[PDB]
Amino acid sequence: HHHHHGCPSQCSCSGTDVNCDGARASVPAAIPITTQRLWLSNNQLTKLDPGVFDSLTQLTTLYLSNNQLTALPAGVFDKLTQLKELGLDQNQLKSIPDGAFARLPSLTHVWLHTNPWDCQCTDILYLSGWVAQHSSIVGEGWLRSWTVNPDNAKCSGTNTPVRAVTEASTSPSKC
Secondary structure, eight states: TTTOOOTTTTOOETTTEEEEOOOOOOOOOOOOOOEEEEOOOOOOSSSSOTTTTTOOTTOOOOOOOOOOOOOTTTTTTTTTTOOOEOOOOOOOOOOOTTTTTTTTOOEEEEEOOSOOBBBGGGGGGHHHHHHHSSGBBBBESGGGGGGGGGGGGGBBOOOBBBOOOOOGBGGGGOO
């Protein structure tokens, strides 16, 4: 269509890219269901509505980096089965809900660094096992600077890698 495109206010859209980075506290409504790449980085997010992404089944890239996310809701990524890139770095996450990445078989780039992962608490063990089993996709940087480095998901206060934590060192009382 001549000089006509199909976009959330304060975001910029082109093709199936939706750039909502840096608009500032909640995920905008009416992100098109055909969206393949979604930037939600550099906003004010401290939580997500459960189900917020459930209609965006064609997503291949999702950036949530550099928010202040304190927790993710269980199942929040369950519908994003075509996701290849998932950015969660530079947030305030202490653990990942059990099973959160289980339905994401196509991941090739995952960013988890610069979060205060709480490795003494029982709830770290899903993430510890996941990183240990998917080490070749956990990294840092972008394009020319992309480098895999699974030890950059680090335990707050000791800087030990999250993937080295096993059940016998954790305690429910530290949650």
